[PDB]
Amino acid sequence: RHVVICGWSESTLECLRELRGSEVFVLAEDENVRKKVLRSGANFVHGDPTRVSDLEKANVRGARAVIVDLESDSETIHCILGIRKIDESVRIIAEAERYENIEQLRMAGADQVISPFVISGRLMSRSIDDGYEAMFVQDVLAEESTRRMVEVPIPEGSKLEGVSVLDADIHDVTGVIIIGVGRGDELIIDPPRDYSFRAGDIILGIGKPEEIERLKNYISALVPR
Amino acid sequence: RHVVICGWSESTLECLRELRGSEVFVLAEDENVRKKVLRSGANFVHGDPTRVSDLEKANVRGARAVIVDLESDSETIHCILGIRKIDESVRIIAEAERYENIEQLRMAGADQVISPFVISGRLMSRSIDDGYEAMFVQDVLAEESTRRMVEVPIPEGSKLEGVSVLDADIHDVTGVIIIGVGRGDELIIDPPRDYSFRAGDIILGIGKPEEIERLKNYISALVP
Ligand SMILES: [Ca+2]
Ligand SMILES: [Ca+2]
Numbered sequence A: 001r002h003v004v005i006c007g008w009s010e011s012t013l014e015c016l017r018e019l020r021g022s023e024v025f026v027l028a029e030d031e032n033v034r035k036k037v038l039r040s041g042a043n044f045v046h047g048d049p050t051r052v053s054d055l056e057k058a059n060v061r062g063a064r065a066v067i068v069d070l071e072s073d074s075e076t077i078h079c080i081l082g083i084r085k086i087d088e089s090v091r092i093i094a095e096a097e098r099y100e101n102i103e104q105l106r107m108a109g110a111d112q113v114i115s116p117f118v119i120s121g122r123l124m125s126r127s128i129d130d131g132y133e134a135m136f137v138q139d140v141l142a143e144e145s146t147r148r149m150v151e152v153p154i155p156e157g158s159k160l161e162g163v164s165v166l167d168a169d170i171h172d173v174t175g176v177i178i179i180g181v182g183r184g185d186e187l188i189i190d191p192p193r194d195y196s197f198r199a200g201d202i203i204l205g206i207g208k209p210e211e212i213e214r215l216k217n218y219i220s221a222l223v224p225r
Numbered sequence B: 001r002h003v004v005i006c007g008w009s010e011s012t013l014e015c016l017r018e019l020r021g022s023e024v025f026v027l028a029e030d031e032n033v034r035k036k037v038l039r040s041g042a043n044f045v046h047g048d049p050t051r052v053s054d055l056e057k058a059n060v061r062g063a064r065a066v067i068v069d070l071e072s073d074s075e076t077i078h079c080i081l082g083i084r085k086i087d088e089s090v091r092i093i094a095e096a097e098r099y100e101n102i103e104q105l106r107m108a109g110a111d112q113v114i115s116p117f118v119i120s121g122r123l124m125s126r127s128i129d130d131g132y133e134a135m136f137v138q139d140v141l142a143e144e145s146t147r148r149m150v151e152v153p154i155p156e157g158s159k160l161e162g163v164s165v166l167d168a169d170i171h172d173v174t175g176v177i178i179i180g181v182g183r184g185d186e187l188i189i190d191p192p193r194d195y196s197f198r199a200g201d202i203i204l205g206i207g208k209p210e211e212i213e214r215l216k217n218y219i220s221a222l223v224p
Helices: A010-020 A031-039 A052-057 A073-086 A099-108 A115-125 A134-141 A170-174 A209-218 B010-017 B031-039 B050-059 B074-084 B099-108 B116-125 B132-141 B170-174 B208-218
Strands: A003-006 A026-027 A045-048 A065-068 A089-095 A112-114 A148-153 A175-182 A186-188 A202-207 B003-008 B025-029 B043-046 B065-068 B092-093 B112-114 B148-153 B177-183 B186-189 B204-208
Touching: A003 A010, A010 A026, A026 A031, A026 A052, A031 A045, A052 A073, A065 A073, A073 A089, A073 A099, A089 B116, A089 B148, A099 A112, A099 B010, A112 B116, A112 B208, A115 B010, A115 B092, A115 B112, A115 B116, A115 B132, A134 A148, A134 B116, A134 B132, A134 B148, A134 B177, A134 B186, A134 B204, A148 A209, A148 B132, A170 A175, A170 A202, A170 A209, A175 B132, A175 B177, A186 B132, A202 A209, A202 B132, A209 B025, B003 B010, B010 B025, B025 B031, B025 B050, B031 B043, B050 B074, B065 B074, B074 B092, B074 B099, B099 B112, B116 B132, B132 B148, B170 B177, B170 B204, B170 B208, B204 B208
Parallel strands: A003 A026, A003 A065, A026 A045, A065 A089, A089 A112, B003 B025, B003 B065, B025 B043, B065 B092, B092 B112
Antiparallel strands: A148 A202, A175 A186, A175 A202, B148 B204, B177 B186, B177 B204
16 A cells, blocks of 8 residues: 655655655656655655656556645646556545645546645635634644644444434544544534434544543444344 | 735735725736736735835835735845834734745744645645645635635623633524634644633634624623
8 A cells, every 4th residue: 555646845755855754656756756755754766757658667557646746836737647548446635736736636536635835825814813723724734743633534333323423422522623524525514403323424523532542442332242 | 904915926816805895906017917917906006015115105104914925035035024114013913935935924023924835735735635624715715605714803891701602602692603612822622612812812713794793783882
């Protein structure tokens, strides 16, 4: 199991740091970065992320995911198109440089498009009086963070299958704040009364590590007599 | 009140979208971006963001905050230093596209640094299996969305002065989920039931527009 990164930028550098301990391959046109990629804990492949043969050389086929961030959005689109020819099942995550290009990255094949500047502009507008929201968005997104945002799936046979958020009382049992539930293509915030947890749901929660393990055990199957 | 933006890029373009309604002044060297800044709803000031005289021309003194978004690392620093020569009472928020320059920005006196690529890279690493965490950022930050994150300050004279979060029962009363409370320069995520609110505390919550305005009224002042 392994991850592929197309393009080397400050974003994919940050990405790789977060992937410490996992197998990762980086594909870029600049040979000069090999040493830093290596010390950053990835395997480096010198080549062109828009050319199929090179994406293939970088183990895109059967990758757990491919992360793409080339210098322009048109290069990123071409890489996306090349990846899809190789493997139609592989998850593709793409950074967009300019807002007007977001849908074209999706149309090309990205399962998800991240727009650093859109996120930045939004935080900027929220940071006029203080920095607490940016404090928050940084306090949670980092793996190294103490109290972090985590995803925990509702397993098959869960205690909570068919049970609503109110009956669940997760925050009392576990200490975890439920900030969302990921189901199918949608993320639901503050689920209403008529929401029941279904196996396969992804709980987006915030909590210290021991509160997280508490949640995981809590949502398990009823142990019969 | 008014806000000043030094520089222009995709970041400040999006920023203006969420500031439509505010008086915003954009100061930038590239005359070519006037038309776009104007359509975006800000007033355009042509000039040099590193220069005290042009920063003053852009209404920096007395400004609620200045946002600095310059391609040059060294210019960002000189911009920060120029603002501070004009008015130390201004909140300064600076964008860093290079991690290397963050400490230089703080040394110069930036109050806050935003690093788009740290957030982006972290979101990339959180998105290997699914995109829910990044969806939580698209959904919650776009002020033009259904259920967003809001800062609501506790006004002096608030009904909730000295009132504990358990006793406050905010989520039950208003529908807003409390994520954290900010006091001073610390953000307390998920404050314990016996934490007592104070004027000047900033409640971080997520809710619908009506829940939010419900919370603003709930914590409103006692105005005899
Ligand atoms: Ca990039
Ligand atoms: Ca910038």
